[PDB]
Amino acid sequence: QSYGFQPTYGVGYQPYRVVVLSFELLHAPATVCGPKKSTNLVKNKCVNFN
């Protein structure tokens, strides 16, 4: 069946556009990440890292 979205349908019956994202982990190395300055490395320093 078709929704037949009309302006009259009003705030209750309005048509929304939806997008949904799924995130999975551990099964492979990371490939895509948000903007986060990448830094260099340090050895034998007891650092907290990402």
Partner: peptide, 18 residues
């Protein structure tokens, strides 16, 4: 024809090192 696959087909299930 058929044959016994003795122990073939084992593969590294994950990308982790142990």
């Amino acid at each position: 024809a058929y044959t016994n696959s003795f122990t073939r087909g084992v593969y590294y299930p994950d990308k982790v090192f142990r």
